[PDB]
A paper describes a structure:
In addition, we also solve some key mutants that are regularly used in nanopore experiments, namely, [name] and [name]/[name]. For analyzing the lowest constriction ring, we determined the structure of the [name]/[name] mutant in SMALP obtaining a resolution of 2.2 Å. As expected, the two lysine to alanine mutations also increase the diameter of the lowest two constriction rings without affecting the upper constriction rings. Interestingly, the modification of only K244 leads to a decrease in the lowest constriction, indicating that both K242 and K244 are equally contributing. Also other mutants, such as [name]-[name], R220A, and T240R, have shown improved sensing capabilities by modifying one of the two constriction sites of the pore. In conclusion, we report high-resolution structures of WT [name] along with its [name] and [name]-[name] mutants in SMALPs, amphipols, and LMNG.
[name] is a β-pore-forming toxin produced by most Aeromonas bacteria, which has attracted large attention in the field of nanopore sensing due to its narrow and charged pore lumen. Pore-forming toxins (PFTs) are important virulence factors of many pathogenic bacteria, which are secreted in a soluble form and upon host membrane binding, they oligomerize into transmembrane pores undergoing a complex structural reorganization. Domains 3 and 4 form the 120 Å long 14-stranded β-barrel, with each protomer contributing two antiparallel β-strands. Four distinct constriction rings, two at each end of the pore, were identified from the structures and confirmed by MD simulation.
Residue numbers in the entry:
A (entry chain B): 1 to 12, 25 to 422
B (entry chain A): 160 to 422
The structure:
């Protein structure tokens, strides 16, 4: 009837359906050949009995506490970054030890990654090096000197990339738009003549320009069969001659695929002309490179990737491998995009065994405690806000011009 | 007197661009020459009702296009033949041959196109119990007109030469005196490799130093010297411009609404 979170269970109320809904977690938390009651004559049996639930009696009963608590991840206040360009904000973000470096290192440590730290300290998240690599950043423990341990030279690597911005609607501005390397496409001029006694607005001149590309591929197969007969006869005047007859047949099959993409652009002018007058018009089209600056305020999200090998003594992956494999996983720190990359979705769905496909958070709660994981995940998912300035540029764009001239009396 | 003193460094200026003041642009008379007719149309709009009517339309459109494509094909073929000889009644000795064959083929294609179009319409309003004539014409002609404006001037700056053996500012610091070319854009931002300001501002990030090492220049000459030199280099320029426009084989049109005639 009600969802049961395994971290709230207590062997002092528990329905048979509730016990069956969360079965593997309850079986794993009891000793082998242990028998404890549930409710209304039902009891649950431990390992060695294959977790069978059968009618019985017992004085030791599982019991969900009268008033359990909600285990949601808390929401913290936003972190403010000093204003600058996109790269300055990223640099300021990835160099904060107390707000960024420690929580992510602790998250990697809690999930079972190995050697999250440098050689000059004994604690997680200490002696970490930050480097700029391509469009992202890499954070890894310092590897200078020596270390003592099995594969202590294989430090876990944390990578940050794909930064996105959620703008405030009323903050965006942009400056002057400038053009360079202009090339003419086509122009048109014309006149609109009105010789009636009333104003007229039924005029139209339109210029359009299109470009396109296409591709295709084809495969063909076939067969052929032929029979030939040859003989020789003597015919009058022709004398000896050779006569040959051939009959053939063939079959063929073909298959094709393709595609295309078209780009278009048009300009129109529709002037209103006074009575007994005329008006000139002109339309131009160009190709040019465009540039302009901008500024805004937004919220910053990014992708978080953890790379390393999982500890032999225990890790949080749902299959619990024990051969120290190399692992990669990506989280999206921000709005929901997918189930495999959402921490909140996996955390909220930990009461359904069939939804546990990537990480086992109940194992982490057992290992470290509920409040520790809650605070760590709250610090990890803290919102970030900053002011941004930047520059836009693009090559081979379109530029147009439409003009309506002054009227000339007739 | 010097090692390769005859190889002087060359400075080149090109690609001038203008940022106009919005309220300064003007142009003069537009003139046409070498006019060639395309197509014309005339017509009448008749209104025999008791109210004014505006539901009329005449439209003329002209289109041109080009296209291209390329194709590659490959294939294989296998055949087996058997030949024998037999004696058959009346036919006597004869030769019988049987052949069986198979083939395969693969193909790939690419292409593209570009279309140019232009149209003219007239939609007159006709009074009750009257008629109105219309006419539309299309021409090809060469166009010319003068103009003037005020703008800001930007350009591309290119340096060509070889780098000194005793030390240079390139981030790999070569020492074999190679020939070098590099282009700066003196004006609005277009790219990272050609922006002095972006490279100067990002000198505190070692991973962003990919073209020039400005910290080396600051060590060699001092902060204020480089600041003043770069400030003088990037000074804005303004001027007034007059010019002439011309183009060949453009479009020229004409649309007319005539006077009403009572019915």
């Amino acid at each position: 009837a009600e969802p049961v979170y395994p971290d709230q269970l207590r062997l002092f109320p528990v329905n048979r359906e509730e016990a069956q809904s969360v079965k593997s977690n309850i079986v794993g938390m009891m000793g082998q050949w242990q028998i404890s009651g549930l409710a209304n004559g039902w009891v649950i049996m431990g390992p060695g009995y294959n977790g069978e639930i059968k009618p019985g009696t017992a004085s030791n009963t599982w019991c969900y506490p009268t008033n359990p608590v909600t285990g949601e991840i808390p929401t913290l206040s936003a972190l403010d970054i000093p204003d600058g360009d996109e790269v300055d904000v990223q640099w300021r973000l990835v160099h904060d030890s107390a707000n960024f470096i420690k929580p992510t290192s602790y998250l990697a440590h809690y999930l079972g990654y190995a050697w999250v730290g440098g050689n000059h300290s004994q604690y997680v998240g200490e002696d970490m090096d930050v480097t700029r690599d391509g469009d992202g950043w890499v954070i890894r423990g310092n590897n200078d000197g020596g270390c003592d341990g099995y594969r202590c030279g294989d430090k876990t690597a944390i990578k940050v990339s794909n930064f996105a911005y959620n703008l405030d609607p009323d903050s965006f501005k942009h400056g002057d738009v400038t053009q360079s390397d202009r090339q003419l496409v086509k122009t048109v001029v014309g006149w609109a003549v009105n010789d009636s006694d009333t104003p007229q607005s039924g005029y139209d001149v339109t210029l359009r320009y299109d470009t396109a590309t296409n591709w295709s591929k084809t495969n063909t197969y076939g067969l052929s069969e032929a029979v030939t007969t040859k003989n020789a006869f003597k015919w009058p005047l022709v004398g000896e001659t050779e006569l040959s007859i051939e009959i053939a047949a063939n079959q063929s099959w073909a298959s094709q695929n393709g595609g295309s993409t078209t780009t278009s652009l048009s300009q129109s002018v529709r002037p209103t002309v006074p009575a007994r007058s005329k008006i000139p018009v002109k339309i131009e089209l160009y190709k040019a490179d465009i540039s302009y600056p901008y500024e805004f305020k937004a919220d910053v999200s990014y992708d978080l990737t953890l790379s390393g090998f999982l500890r032999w003594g225990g890790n949080a992956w749902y299959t619990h491998p024990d051969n120290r494999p190399n692992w990669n996983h990506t989280f999206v720190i921000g709005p929901y995009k997918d189930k495999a990359s959402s921490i909140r979705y996996q955390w909220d769905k930990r009461y359904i065994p069939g939804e546990v496909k990537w990480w086992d958070w109940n194992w982490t709660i057992q290992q470290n405690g509920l409040s520790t994981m809650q605070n760590n995940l709250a610090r990890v998912l803290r919102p970030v806000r900053a002011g941004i300035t930047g520059d836009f540029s693009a090559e081979s764009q379109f530029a147009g011009n439409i003009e309506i001239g002054a009227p000339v009396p007739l």
